[PDB]
Write a protein that binds this ligand. Structure first.
Ligand SMILES: COc1ccc(C2=NO[C@@H](CC(=O)N(CCO)CCO)C2)cc1OC1CCCC1
Ligand SMILES: COc1ccc(C2=NO[C@@H](CC(=O)N(CCO)CCO)C2)cc1OC1CCCC1
Ligand SMILES: [Mg+2]
Ligand SMILES: [Mg+2]
Ligand SMILES: [Mg+2]
Ligand SMILES: [Mg+2]
Ligand SMILES: [Zn+2]
Ligand SMILES: [Zn+2]
Lengths: 324, 322
C-alpha cells in the first residue's frame, strides 16, 4: 500500500521516517530493518530465518520506550536507515565485507535501546543504578549494548545463529566498538583522529578508500554511525524541525526532574530559559558541522549535498536570531 | 591476644597475613583494615563511625569467596596491607592528601571483591552474564567496583556518609581509576607510562616526589596498587610459596572447567602439564621484575630491599625447576 511506496525511498537521504512510523503502526525499526536486510541480501548471505529476524526486531523495537520523545524506535530506525545510505557512498564501494556491513547496521539498530530519556551526566549525578553498574563510564552506551545483545537470547531471536564462531566473535567486537563510539564524551577524540585520517588518507585508482587494518576500518565505521546519529540537521527542514521538537521535549523533561531535585539545571534543559534557535545553531556550529565537514572531506564529493542541506538549515535557524 | 602481637608488623613488608587470617577467625581483611584506619587516623579525619566501618568491612569480607583459593579475602587483606606500607615510603612523605590515602586503601580493599576464581578471558569465552553486562571490557574489574560501591548501601555500611559531596565525587573517581588499572591487559601501558614518569622525575632536596596535578597523583596511586597486587614474589619466601600454591590451585580449577567444556586450556591452567617453578620465574622475568624495578627507580632507594628479595625469590624457583 502507501507503506510499500514510502519504503521505495529507503536508499535515499531524507526518507520520511515519521510517515513510515505512522503507517507501520509504530513499527518503523522493524520494517526499515527488514527492508534493508532484504535489499542488501543479508538474510541469504547469513542464513537468517525471516521469522527469526522479525521476532528479534519486534522485541528490540519493544525495548525502545514509547514515552521517550527523542530516543525511541523512530530515532533507531532513522539512524539505521542513515547508516544504510552512508554505507553505499561511492568512496566506500566494495571496501567493507558483508560482516562489517551487518555489524554497522545492527549496531545502529541497537545503539540507543532502552534509553531512559536522560543523559549520562544525569544518571551519574543522581546516583542511578546504571551509573553504579558501569562506574560512570559510557553508562548508557554500555547498557544499550548489553540489552541489544541480551535480547538475542529470547525465543527464536538469535539472528546470528548460522554465523561461524569466528564470525560471531568478530561481529560482537565491531558492534561494541561502534556503539561505544556514540558516547558524546568521545566526540572530540573521534573527530581529532578522523581529521588525521583524512590528512593521510589513501585511495585506489578506482577512487575508493584504502583501509588495510582493523584500526582504520573500525574507525571509519565508528564515525559513520556517529555521523548518522548526528544527522538530524542534515535532513530536509520539515524532518529536522520535528527532531528538534522531540529533543527539546526530552531535554525539558530532564530539566524538570533536575528542578524538582533542587539540582542545577543542565544546559538547554530549562524550559523557561532556553532558545531553541540559538541552541540548534550552536549544536551545528560546534558539533554537527565540524563532524560532517570532516566526513565530507573523507568521501569528497559524495556528501556535498548533505553538507549543503546542513549549511542551509543552519542559515535558516540563525535567521530569526537578532544579530549585530 | 596473640593477634595483637602479629599486627605489630602491619607496617612491615612481609606481615604474616596467613597467620592473621587464622588468629582472626578468617577475618584478615576486617582486622587489617580496622588497624590501618585507626593508625592513619582516618576515622577521625572523615568522621567514620567505628561501628559503620566494622559493619562495612565484615560485609565486604563476606563477599570475597571462601572457596576461591587465591582471589579471596586474604589476598584482599594482603593488597590493602602492602598498599599501606607503600604509602609510607619516604619518597612519598606528605605527598598525598588524606582523601587520596583513603581512596588507595579503599580501592585495594574492594579491588577483587566477588571474584569467581576465573579470568576475564574465561568469562568472555563462556559467554558469561558478566562479560555480557560489561561488553567484554575489564569485566571483573568493573564488577569489583560495582560490588564494592553497592555494599556501601547496606544497613549501617556507608563509611563515606560524612564526606562532603565533592569529596565523595573525587574519591569515587580515584577509586574507579585505581581498580580499573588492576586489569592485567593494561599492565604494559601502565608500565610504559610509569617509565615515562621515572624519566621526567621531579623531587625535592630530600628526594620527595613532586607531583603536579591529578594525572601525576593518580598515576602514582594506580601503579602503587598494581605493584601491591603483584607483590607476592617480593615477599619473604614462605609467604610467596603459599601464594604460589594458591594461585596454581585456582588456575588449575579453571583449567578443569575448560577441559570439561572441550575448550583450549589457558596458559598455566593445565594441572596435567604444568611447570609451576618455571612459570614463577617467567612471571618474575617478564612482569613482576620490570614493574618493581621501575617502581624502585621512582622511589630510589626506598624499595631496594624489596627488589633484592624479588631477585632472591626468583633464584629459589629457578633452583627448584625439576
Ligand atoms: C535535533 O537536535 C538534536 C539532535 C540530537 C542531539 C544529541 N546530542 O547528544 C546526543 C545525546 C547524547 O549523547 N547526550 C545528550 C543527552 O541525551 C550526551 C549524554 O548522554 C544526541 C542534540 C540535538 O540538539 C540538542 C537540542 C539543543 C542543542 C542540543
Ligand atoms: C604467586 O603467583 C602469582 C600471583 C598473582 C598472579 C596474577 N596474575 O595476574 C593477576 C590475575 C589476573 O589478573 N588474571 C589471571 C586470572 O586471575 C587475568 C584476569 O582476567 C594476578 C599470578 C601469579 O603467578 C601465576 C602462576 C603462573 C605464573 C603466573
Ligand atoms: Mg546514544
Ligand atoms: Mg615481631
Ligand atoms: Mg583483580
Ligand atoms: Mg609532574
Ligand atoms: Zn542515538
Ligand atoms: Zn588482586
Amino acid at each position: 500500500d502507501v507503506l510499500a511506496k514510502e519504503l521505495e525511498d529507503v536508499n535515499k537521504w531524507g526518507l520520511h521516517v515519521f510517515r513510515i512510523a505512522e503507517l507501520s503502526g509504530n513499527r518503523p525499526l522493524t520494517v526499515i530493518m527488514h527492508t534493508i536486510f532484504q535489499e542488501r541480501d543479508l538474510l541469504k548471505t547469513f542464513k537468517i530465518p525471516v521469522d527469526t529476524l522479525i521476532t528479534y526486531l519486534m522485541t528490540l523495537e519493544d525495548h525502545y520506550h514509547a514515552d521517550v520523545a527523542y530516543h525511541n524506535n523512530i530515532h533507531a530506525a532513522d539512524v539505521v536507515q542513515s547508516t544504510h545510505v552512508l554505507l553505499s557512498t561511492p568512496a566506500l564501494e566494495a571496501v567493507f565485507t558483508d560482516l562489517e556491513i551487518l555489524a554497522a547496521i545492527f549496531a545502529s539498530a541497537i545503539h540507543d535501546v532502552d534509553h531512559p530519556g536522560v543523559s549520562n551526566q544525569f544518571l551519574i549525578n543522581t546516583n542511578s543504578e546504571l551509573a553504579l553498574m558501569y562506574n560512570d563510564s559510557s553508562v548508557l552506551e554500555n547498557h544499550h549494548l548489553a540489552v541489544g545483545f541480551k535480547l538475542l537470547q529470547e525465543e527464536n531471536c538469535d539472528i546470528f545463529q548460522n554465523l561461524t564462531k569466528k564470525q560471531r566473535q568478530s561481529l560482537r567486537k565491531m558492534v561494541i566498538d561502534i556503539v561505544l563510539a556514540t558516547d558524546m564524551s568521545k566526540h572530540m577524540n573521534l573527530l581529532a583522529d578522523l581529521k588525521t585520517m583524512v590528512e593521510t588518507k589513501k585511495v585506489t585508482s578506482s577512487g575508493v578508500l584504502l583501509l588495510d587494518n582493523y584500526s582504520d576500518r573500525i574507525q571509519v565505521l565508528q564515525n559513520m554511525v556517529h555521523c548518522a546519529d548526528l544527522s538530524n540537521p542534515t535532513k530536509p527542514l520539515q524532518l529536522y524541525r520535528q527532531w528538534t521538537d522531540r529533543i527539546m521535549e526530552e531535554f525539558f523533561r530532564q530539566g524538570d526532574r533536575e528542578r524538582e531535585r533542587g539540582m542545577e539545571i543542565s544546559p538547554m534543559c530549562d524550559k523557561h530559559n532556553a532558545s531553541v534557535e540559538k541552541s540548534q545553531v550552536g549544536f551545528i556550529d560546534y558539533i554537527v558541522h565540524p563532524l560532517w565537514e570532516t566526513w565530507a572531506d573523507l568521501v569528497h564529493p559524495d556528501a556535498q549535498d548533505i553538507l549543503d542541506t546542513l549549511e542551509d538549515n543552519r542559515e535558516w535557524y540563525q535567521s530569526t536570531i537578532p544579530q549585530a
